[PDB]
Amino acid sequence: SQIRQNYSTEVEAAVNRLVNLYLRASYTYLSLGFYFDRDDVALEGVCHFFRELAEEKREGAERLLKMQNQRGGRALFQDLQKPSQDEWGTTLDAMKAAIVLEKSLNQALLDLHALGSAQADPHLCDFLESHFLDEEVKLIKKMGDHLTNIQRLVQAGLGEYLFERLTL
Amino acid sequence: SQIRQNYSTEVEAAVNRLVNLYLRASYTYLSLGFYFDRDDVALEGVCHFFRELAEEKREGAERLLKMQNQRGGRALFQDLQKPSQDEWGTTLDAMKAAIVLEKSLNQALLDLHALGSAQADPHLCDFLESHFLDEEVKLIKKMGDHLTNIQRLVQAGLGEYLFERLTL
Amino acid sequence: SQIRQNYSTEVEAAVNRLVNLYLRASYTYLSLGFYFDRDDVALEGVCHFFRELAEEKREGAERLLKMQNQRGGRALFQDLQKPSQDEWGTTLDAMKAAIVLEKSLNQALLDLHALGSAQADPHLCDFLESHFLDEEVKLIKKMGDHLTNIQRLVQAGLGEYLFERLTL
Amino acid sequence: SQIRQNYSTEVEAAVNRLVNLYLRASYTYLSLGFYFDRDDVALEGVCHFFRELAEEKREGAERLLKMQNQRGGRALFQDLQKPSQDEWGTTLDAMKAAIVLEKSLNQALLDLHALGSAQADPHLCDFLESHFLDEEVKLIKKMGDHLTNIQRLVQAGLGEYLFERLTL
Ligand SMILES: CC(C)c1ccccc1O
Ligand SMILES: CC(C)c1ccccc1O
Numbered sequence: 001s002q003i004r005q006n007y008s009t010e011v012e013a014a015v016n017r018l019v020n021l022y023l024r025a026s027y028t029y030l031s032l033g034f035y036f037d038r039d040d041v042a043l044e045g046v047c048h049f050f051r052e053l054a055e056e057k058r059e060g061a062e063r064l065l066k067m068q069n070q071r072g073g074r075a076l077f078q079d080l081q082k083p084s085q086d087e088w089g090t091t092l093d094a095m096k097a098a099i100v101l102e103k104s105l106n107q108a109l110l111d112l113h114a115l116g117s118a119q120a121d122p123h124l125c126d127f128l129e130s131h132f133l134d135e136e137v138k139l140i141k142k143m144g145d146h147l148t149n150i151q152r153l154v155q156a157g158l159g160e161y162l163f164e165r166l167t168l
Numbered sequence: 169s170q171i172r173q174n175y176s177t178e179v180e181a182a183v184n185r186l187v188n189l190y191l192r193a194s195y196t197y198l199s200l201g202f203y204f205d206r207d208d209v210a211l212e213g214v215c216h217f218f219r220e221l222a223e224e225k226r227e228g229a230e231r232l233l234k235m236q237n238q239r240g241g242r243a244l245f246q247d248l249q250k251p252s253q254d255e256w257g258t259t260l261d262a263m264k265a266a267i268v269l270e271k272s273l274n275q276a277l278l279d280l281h282a283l284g285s286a287q288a289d290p291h292l293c294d295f296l297e298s299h300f301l302d303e304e305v306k307l308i309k310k311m312g313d314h315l316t317n318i319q320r321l322v323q324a325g326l327g328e329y330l331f332e333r334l335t336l
Numbered sequence: 337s338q339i340r341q342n343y344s345t346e347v348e349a350a351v352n353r354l355v356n357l358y359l360r361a362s363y364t365y366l367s368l369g370f371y372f373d374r375d376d377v378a379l380e381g382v383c384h385f386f387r388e389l390a391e392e393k394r395e396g397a398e399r400l401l402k403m404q405n406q407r408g409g410r411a412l413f414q415d416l417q418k419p420s421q422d423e424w425g426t427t428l429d430a431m432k433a434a435i436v437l438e439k440s441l442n443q444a445l446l447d448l449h450a451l452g453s454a455q456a457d458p459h460l461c462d463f464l465e466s467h468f469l470d471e472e473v474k475l476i477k478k479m480g481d482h483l484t485n486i487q488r489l490v491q492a493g494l495g496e497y498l499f500e501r502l503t504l
Numbered sequence: 505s506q507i508r509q510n511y512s513t514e515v516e517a518a519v520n521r522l523v524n525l526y527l528r529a530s531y532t533y534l535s536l537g538f539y540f541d542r543d544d545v546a547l548e549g550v551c552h553f554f555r556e557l558a559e560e561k562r563e564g565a566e567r568l569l570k571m572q573n574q575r576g577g578r579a580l581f582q583d584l585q586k587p588s589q590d591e592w593g594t595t596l597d598a599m600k601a602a603i604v605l606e607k608s609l610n611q612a613l614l615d616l617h618a619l620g621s622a623q624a625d626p627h628l629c630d631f632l633e634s635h636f637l638d639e640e641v642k643l644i645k646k647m648g649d650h651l652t653n654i655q656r657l658v659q660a661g662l663g664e665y666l667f668e669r670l671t672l
Pocket of ligand 2: 530
């Protein structure tokens with residue numbers, strides 16, 4: 001690329017992999033959202049929580065793709081693997097799966113940051129710090145807070161209803 | 169001091185001690201606030217309740233220091249002892265500790281008022297009555313009300329969640 | 337902690353130490369502020385300057401404590417040592433002591449940043465850069481500017497009055 | 505009086521004496537104000553400072569007289585002695601004389617409060633605390649602050665001009 005400068009092939013590939021991870025996460029959240037919209041699950045606050053996260057993860061992927069082009073790298077897309085479950089159990093189960101997912105995304109961000117540091121790519125490092133790393137820490141703290149409240153509420157049906165009504 | 173009039177060395181020293189007590193109380197409330205912000209505690213209403221009290225106690229100390237200077241006394245600061253606990257247990261435990269703390273502050277105010285009366289210092293007496301004594305009585309009544317509601321709510325997890333959601 | 341990820345015990349402890357340093361600095365500024373409010377000192381602009389700094393340092397400590405919880409670390413508080421002086425001398429003396437204090441806080445921030453870099457903790461590194469490092473550089477530049485103006489003004493009483501009236 | 509209740513002849517007389525003291529103080533401040541308005545003195549800020557105090561002391565006297573009537577006592581007026589000086593010297597001299605005057609008024613208030621306490625007259629005690637004692641403490645602190653600034657400014661002519669321009 002005529003514009004490419006200080007942008008390694010290793011980072012370019014890792015960015016494409018991270019796009020795939022963010023799109024997969026968006027897909028997982030889409031599935032979580034619609035599961036909580038089932039008439040036999042019917043927790044609207046939980047559905048809304050996960051639909052908003054599907055939106056956030058898609059936006060993350062789009063920001064990465066914008067950055068790939070800004071740097072002169074080439075976006076390459078792969079299949080998006082279907083989510084790991086078809087049914088997501090209770091709100092507690094779902095929130096546990098969400099924190100597992102976010103910790104994996106965070107680890108991928110940290111790995112990419114390490115790669116950028118190793119490659120002396122400060123634009124990449126700053127981009128991640130500015131748009132992704134703090135967003136992830138805040139979201140994981142919020143999920144942990146939710147998990148703690150859900151756990152203290154387990155008369156499990158009553159507790160699940162109250163959390164959806166009064167927290168979400 | 170060129171302005172000092174009817175202001176005993178005994179009152180001046182007791183005011184400095186009371187500043188220290190109010191700052192210690194602010195510090196204790198700071199610790200309480202952040203404990204309830206822990207991801208494994210996660211009671212935001214409780215965190216907010218104690219953070220607002222940390223602010224109130226600091227403001228109290230500052231008012232005392234302003235008064236010390238208005239009277240021509242000299243502020244003298246001492247170390248602030250760390251709070252008595254590192255972890256504060258349940259909301260019930262915390263509210264019990266808060267009422268113990270406020271009763272101690274109130275007793276110190278009453279002791280200082282008695283000293284002012286003994287020293288025939290009506291400005292001091294009025295200052296305490298106007299800015300501190302009623303504030304303390306109101307706060308202790310509110311804490312007692314909270315303690316009673318928390319106690320009636322002990323399915324203890326459920327009760328702790330509902331109090332934070334519906335009262336705080 | 338269920339949320340803790342890439343957050344070393346070394347950083348967690350250093351953050352707690354830095355909270356203590358920021359709270360100690362707030363306390364020092366509280367003492368400076370009230371000294372300049374003494375009827376026999378009576379430099380209101382100087383009092384206001386240091387009271388605003390006491391507020392800034394407390395806010396810094398609170399931001400650190402918020403971050404400690406976001407990362408899944410545990411806040412631990414220690415005694416707050418009383419300020420190093422009971423009386424602070426002239427505005428020049430006070431401003432010299434303030435720059436010494438800020439340079440110490442800045443060094444602690446730089447030490448913690450180095451630790452974060454060594455531990456490959458980019459969230460910590462970014463947090464400090466974003467909220468603390470530039471704030472410190474700006475404040476130290478402002479103090480240095482003030483020190484230079486105070487020094488050029490030493491008829492020392494006249495100079496002290498004019499600085500408080502026309503700069504602060 | 506048909507309305508008089510718990511109001512001793514001793515307090516009634518002391519209130520009349522205190523009215524006289526407040527009116528005398530107003531007169532003294534009137535003289536101070538106009539001295540600083542002399543073409544060969546010409547310190548407008550100082551003139552304004554003392555004219556506002558003449559107003560405050562007259563208002564104090566009127567509040568006392570209103571209270572005397574509310575309690576069923578009988579106002580009795582005496583001659584108002586002319587102020588102690590015809591010419592008031594420098595701003596420093598004047599501010600020294602003003603603090604002497606206010607300390608005397610404050611002592612009279614404290615004496616009357618003691619008398620009210622001895623006579624078990626809480627309405628009197630509260631009236632003084634609410635309308636006079638804190639006003640006096642604040643005014644004496646302000647005068648002490650002014651005296652300190654005037655003293656640090658003594659090139660005495662230059663210092664007198666700057667204080668009037670930049671403080672008053
Ligand atoms: C003394 C001030 C700075 C303080 C210390 C600790 C906790 C809260 C405070 O306001
Ligand atoms: C007593 C009133 C009329 C009075 C006299 C002298 C100076 C000021 C005053 O308000």
